[PDB]
Amino acid sequence: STEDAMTVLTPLTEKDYEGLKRVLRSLQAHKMAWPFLEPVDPNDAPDYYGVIKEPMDLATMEERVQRRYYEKLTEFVADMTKIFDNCRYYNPSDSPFYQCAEVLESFFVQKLKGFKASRSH
């Protein structure tokens, strides 16, 4: 679709980055975002960094958004998707972390669809 190819192909502008920061800020303020605000503490999960290849967290993405790290929206979505995929990979489905990744990813998808619609019209 128009938004699909534009997500893959259209380079991010300074205007887009205003939308990326807003989406991220709305995630950081969500009540179920508490496990993803900062990197996982390895004292809380000893084997986490031995099994998770590419860890990710909202503070790392905030730094990358600040430094204009992302060139395409797909790269931004890929980093965010890693946060939730890493969580559901390491934790059981009845874990509070797992449940948070399910709620927050749905919330992110709602906000991402709003951002994609604002770039095209």
Ligand SMILES: Cn1cnc(Nc2ccc(CCN)cc2)c(Cl)c1=O
């Ligand atoms: C297994 N596992 C553990 N903790 C997670 N988040 C998280 C990050 C930081 C803090 C407090 C910071 N000292 C608490 C929880 C995730 Cl996401 C996870 O999967």
